[PDB]
Write a protein that binds this DNA or RNA. Sequence first.
RNA 1: GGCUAAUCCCCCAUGUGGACCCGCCCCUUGGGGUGUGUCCAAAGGGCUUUGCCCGCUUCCGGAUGGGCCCGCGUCCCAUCAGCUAGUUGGUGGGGUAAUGGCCCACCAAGGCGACGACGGGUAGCCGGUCUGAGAGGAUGGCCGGCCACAGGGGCACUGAGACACGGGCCCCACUCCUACGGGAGGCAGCAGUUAGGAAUCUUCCGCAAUGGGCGCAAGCCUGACGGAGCGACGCCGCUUGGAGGAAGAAGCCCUUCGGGGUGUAAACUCCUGAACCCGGGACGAAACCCCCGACGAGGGGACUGACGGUACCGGGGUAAUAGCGCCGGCCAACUCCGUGCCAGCAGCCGCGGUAAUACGGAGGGCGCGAGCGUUACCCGGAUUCACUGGGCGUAAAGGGCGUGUAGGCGGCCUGGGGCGUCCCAUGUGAAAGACCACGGCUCAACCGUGGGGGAGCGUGGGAUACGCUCAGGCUAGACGGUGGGAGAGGGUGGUGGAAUUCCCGGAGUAGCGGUGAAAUGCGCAGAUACCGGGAGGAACGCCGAUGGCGAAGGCAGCCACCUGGUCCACCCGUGACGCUGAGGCGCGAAAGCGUGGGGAGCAAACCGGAUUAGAUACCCGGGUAGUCCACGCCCUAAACGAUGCGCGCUAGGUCUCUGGGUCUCCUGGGGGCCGAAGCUAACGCGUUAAGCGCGCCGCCUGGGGAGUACGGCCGCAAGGC
RNA 2: UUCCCGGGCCUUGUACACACCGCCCGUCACGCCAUGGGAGCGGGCUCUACCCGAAGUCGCCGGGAGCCUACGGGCAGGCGCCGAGGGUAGGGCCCGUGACUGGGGCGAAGUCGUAACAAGGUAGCUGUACCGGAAGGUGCGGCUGGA
Lengths: 137, 125
Amino acid sequence: LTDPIADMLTRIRNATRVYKESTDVPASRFKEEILRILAREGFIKGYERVDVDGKPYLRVYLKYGPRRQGPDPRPEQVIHHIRRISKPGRRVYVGVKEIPRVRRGLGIAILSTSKGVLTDREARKLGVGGELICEVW
Amino acid sequence: PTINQLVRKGREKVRKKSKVPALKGAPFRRGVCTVVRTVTPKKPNSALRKVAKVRLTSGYEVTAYIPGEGHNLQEHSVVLIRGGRVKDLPGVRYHIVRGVYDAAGVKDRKKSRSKYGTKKPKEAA
RNA sequence: GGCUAAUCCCCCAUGUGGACCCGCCCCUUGGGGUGUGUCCAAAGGGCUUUGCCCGCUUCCGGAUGGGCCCGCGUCCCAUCAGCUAGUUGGUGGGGUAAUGGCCCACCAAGGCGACGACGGGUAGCCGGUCUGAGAGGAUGGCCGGCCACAGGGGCACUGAGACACGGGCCCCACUCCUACGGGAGGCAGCAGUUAGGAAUCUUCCGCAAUGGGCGCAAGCCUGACGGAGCGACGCCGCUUGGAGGAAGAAGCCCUUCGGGGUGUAAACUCCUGAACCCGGGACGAAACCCCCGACGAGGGGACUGACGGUACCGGGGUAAUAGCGCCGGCCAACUCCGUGCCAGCAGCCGCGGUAAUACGGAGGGCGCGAGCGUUACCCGGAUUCACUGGGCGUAAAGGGCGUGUAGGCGGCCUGGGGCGUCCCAUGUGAAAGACCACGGCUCAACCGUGGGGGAGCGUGGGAUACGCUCAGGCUAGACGGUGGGAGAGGGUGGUGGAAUUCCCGGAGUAGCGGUGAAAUGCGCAGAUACCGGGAGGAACGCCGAUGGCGAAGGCAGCCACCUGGUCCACCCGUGACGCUGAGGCGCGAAAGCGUGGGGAGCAAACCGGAUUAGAUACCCGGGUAGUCCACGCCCUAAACGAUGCGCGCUAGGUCUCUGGGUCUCCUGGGGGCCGAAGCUAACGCGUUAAGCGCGCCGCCUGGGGAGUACGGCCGCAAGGC
RNA sequence: UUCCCGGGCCUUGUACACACCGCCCGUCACGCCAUGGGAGCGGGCUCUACCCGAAGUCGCCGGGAGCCUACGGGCAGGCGCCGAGGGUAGGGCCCGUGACUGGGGCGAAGUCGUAACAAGGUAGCUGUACCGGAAGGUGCGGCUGGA
Ligand SMILES: [Mg+2]
Ligand SMILES: [Mg+2]
Ligand SMILES: [Mg+2]
Ligand SMILES: [Mg+2]
Ligand SMILES: [Mg+2]
Ligand SMILES: [Mg+2]
Ligand SMILES: [Mg+2]
Ligand SMILES: [Mg+2]
Ligand SMILES: [Mg+2]
Ligand SMILES: [Mg+2]
Ligand SMILES: [Mg+2]
Ligand SMILES: [Mg+2]
Ligand SMILES: [Mg+2]
Ligand SMILES: [Mg+2]
Ligand SMILES: [Mg+2]
Ligand SMILES: [Mg+2]
Ligand SMILES: [Mg+2]
Ligand SMILES: [Mg+2]
Ligand SMILES: [Mg+2]
Ligand SMILES: [Mg+2]
Ligand SMILES: [Mg+2]
Ligand SMILES: [Mg+2]
Ligand SMILES: [Mg+2]
Ligand SMILES: [Mg+2]
Ligand SMILES: [Mg+2]
Ligand SMILES: [Mg+2]
Ligand SMILES: [Mg+2]
Ligand SMILES: [Mg+2]
Ligand SMILES: [Mg+2]
Ligand SMILES: [Mg+2]
Ligand SMILES: [Mg+2]
Ligand SMILES: [Mg+2]
Ligand SMILES: [Mg+2]
Ligand SMILES: [Mg+2]
Ligand SMILES: [Mg+2]
Ligand SMILES: [Mg+2]
Ligand SMILES: [Mg+2]
Ligand SMILES: [Mg+2]
Ligand SMILES: [Mg+2]
Ligand SMILES: [Mg+2]
Ligand SMILES: [Mg+2]
Ligand SMILES: [Mg+2]
Ligand SMILES: [Mg+2]
Ligand SMILES: [Mg+2]
Ligand SMILES: [Mg+2]
Ligand SMILES: [Mg+2]
Ligand SMILES: [Mg+2]
Ligand SMILES: [Mg+2]
Ligand SMILES: [Mg+2]
Ligand SMILES: [Mg+2]
Ligand SMILES: [Mg+2]
Ligand SMILES: [Mg+2]
Ligand SMILES: [Mg+2]
Ligand SMILES: [Mg+2]
Ligand SMILES: [Mg+2]
């Protein structure tokens, strides 16, 4: 691994593209805060701490849409798109005046502040900003 | 590339070439002609296009096209070089302005006569 | 040569104070104070006078301006890779207002450079301006700030300040005056002349306002400045009329000749009224001046305009310039006539060789309008340099392969710092430009006033999620340990047989080889075919393949030695030791090169004989280097899976190679096929990804010229990069 | 139903699509354009070493030779270093030009041959070496962009 957060979000993406019930990402505190935000906004059904072969993983329980009708009956995604911004090769840091609109407020930019790991609206209300981790919509 | 390769090397700008070497950006170059003759174009066409090889004030000696129907250009005519190439004529990258120095305008031309350099007539009108 | 005056010079005196050495104290790199010793000041002038005003000298403080130094940013060429003699540092001096290697002596040998030194080319820089959705790209004209120059170059003096446009000295070049021997000059100041060039103006008015210098003031100087003149050079505003007006005059164009278009367009009727005529006529201007008041504050009075009789106001009053580009698709506008690959048009596609909406004209229509087109340059479209925002299997592109330096990136838990990062406050970010609002020119252009923040950087305070560092700990990453496994992995030495060729011996005949058919050729000098023996060299049949090994090239009889890589099981130890990798280094098919050896078969070049019109080829017979070995070079390729490496995720079915097991079966590594989701322009890929993501390196920016030329490096050369 | 001529269906290959009476390659001949090498010629920029070296700051002398307003001092003058620039000699870089020569590109429809595209009539391509008017042929090894 080089960036464990991009590995976690890519594993969540590949889980959403095949409509799996749950997957296992490695356990970290920062990953747990990201999954806390993804559970508070309603992109997943929540997480739990599990131990696979004595080694701590995380059961990310996936959320999907209603089973559609007509051809291609795969349901619409909850997580249509997820992409890391602040790469370990190219770090991104923004201020409070520099927090983007994300699909006209429909999406979210999870970003890391000095007051903890926050969202785009919580970094505007508190007025802090920081390292812009990823976008989810 | 990667981000580090863009730090170590960066991007390369375009650095184009001017198609008109008329000495440091002059829109017009005065010149005295040397040889006035007719040439033949490329295969897709067939005509006798009127040209003149002009020795001009930048030290260059280029060939230019003579537009219009008929001209008064000779071995020692002082012309003005405009710019722009002729596609069917290789080597010709220039035009001769009419209505200046020694290149008079097209006689009896009335529709498009600013280009080709002809005065307004007056047929009691 | 001789007088002579000063706010000119010099000497003596006092010393608030200042300077210098020494010592001490505070501060702490030359700041402040103190004691002894020493040194250093001056100038008068004018009135309404023994009272002021302008001046003088020393010092301290303030304001403004400036010198010097430092952090960061600032074009292209790596076909510029090594640069450095005062060069780098110290000590003592000189010089400066002042640090400084600025300069000079002595000592040391350092200093800079892939984070791009040195060199070459180009360029004044910035606020800003143009474009662009933004990010960016381009640019530095007018205005403002800084720099540097005043024909080229060098130098000092006066001076608070200059290395000094209109000051000085010298050398070179140019012009002019010379009685020839020695003198004057420096428009890149405002006009203006000449040359160059596509191109850039008036040898105008005034100090009336602002500002600068001198002077107590009156006042004087100011080509700064305020204006006027010229150029559609740009922008803005206005005019060449408006309302009526024939089922629609004439001319002209088209016509299926009945008609349609120009076209309310025109002529014609009413009306307003540009330009012109008359009269008036300024804002910009109020101080400095004078009087009262103590020439203070305050009040009052008087003089002064270039622009200019100009803007403007009032009355009268005339129908009064329109042109330019286009009309095939982009792209808006269609017919006729002339021409007929001719004349010609053209930004691309491309038209014209007889019926052209593309050439030329006419009618008409379109787009602008005192402008319209063309040319030159910048941005855009160009997401064709992709940070935003591109790609590399086949279109351009994965380095031939590995090791590995710098660099880039990096697993889990808990603390300290708070550097990156974030927040707040404060200072700066000049003015002008841009944005918004309100106003002044009758609008606008132009201008004024007010407000609002950008970005960056200094300082203070606060936060620790992430990146960083320090410290403690953990094991999934990586490596090791133990016990095994498979393999054409590599090097050295030895060895077995089949087969080919040659030599010898026996026997044996009139043909053998060869082709599509022939021929050259070999053969009664006893061939081919048969047997026996001997010599020599090269490659290893069957096993043996859709197989295995290796990083690639590549590796295949067998045996022995030396040796690397790799896989499984046990989960034993270290404990983040990891991944990639610009250079460098090593390996690197075949052909080729050098030295020596060897040479049976094959076989470039060469020689024949056929085919063919011709054969420098294909076919056949000979045949030299080479193919083989040792050592040293050469570094190329369809070196290909045309797919770089490492890691994590994402249905499976099936064949096979190799371990382990609790052997219907499960698990690990590897080699193939079909295929979920997904990707691709398609072919196709598909856990051996070309899918989903991260880290790093290499590479691409239309084809040809061209992997060519020049330069550099390597090679004996061919040649390679 | 092997052969020659014409034809129908399927499949494979193509660089053909005015469609094999297709396309296309290279040498030679003529003209033009740009360019490399080239005995050399001319010019510009720059570096090093030395010789001469004005004005001028600075450092000594200021004396058998001057002038002074305060003299164990000053001015003039003299000597020395640096010194713009001029000269000499040798390098480096760049630009134009040069008899001749190599190859590139475009032209009018030229001459010779058949290389490649279909098994293009010897499968093609590539590295290397040799040879041949020329495309090319052959030898070794490699690839499927053919069976
Ligand atoms: Mg005292
Ligand atoms: Mg005294
Ligand atoms: Mg310059
Ligand atoms: Mg753009
Ligand atoms: Mg001059
Ligand atoms: Mg002066
Ligand atoms: Mg002057
Ligand atoms: Mg002229
Ligand atoms: Mg004045
Ligand atoms: Mg004044
Ligand atoms: Mg009217
Ligand atoms: Mg009518
Ligand atoms: Mg009519
Ligand atoms: Mg006034
Ligand atoms: Mg149209
Ligand atoms: Mg047209
Ligand atoms: Mg026409
Ligand atoms: Mg106008
Ligand atoms: Mg762009
Ligand atoms: Mg462009
Ligand atoms: Mg990108
Ligand atoms: Mg692309
Ligand atoms: Mg390719
Ligand atoms: Mg490769
Ligand atoms: Mg490595
Ligand atoms: Mg980390
Ligand atoms: Mg910090
Ligand atoms: Mg400002
Ligand atoms: Mg640690
Ligand atoms: Mg253990
Ligand atoms: Mg090799
Ligand atoms: Mg070899
Ligand atoms: Mg050899
Ligand atoms: Mg020998
Ligand atoms: Mg043979
Ligand atoms: Mg024949
Ligand atoms: Mg014959
Ligand atoms: Mg043979
Ligand atoms: Mg292969
Ligand atoms: Mg497998
Ligand atoms: Mg497949
Ligand atoms: Mg090209
Ligand atoms: Mg080559
Ligand atoms: Mg049938
Ligand atoms: Mg043919
Ligand atoms: Mg030539
Ligand atoms: Mg040459
Ligand atoms: Mg030469
Ligand atoms: Mg000569
Ligand atoms: Mg022929
Ligand atoms: Mg052929
Ligand atoms: Mg063939
Ligand atoms: Mg062939
Ligand atoms: Mg041959
Ligand atoms: Mg072969």
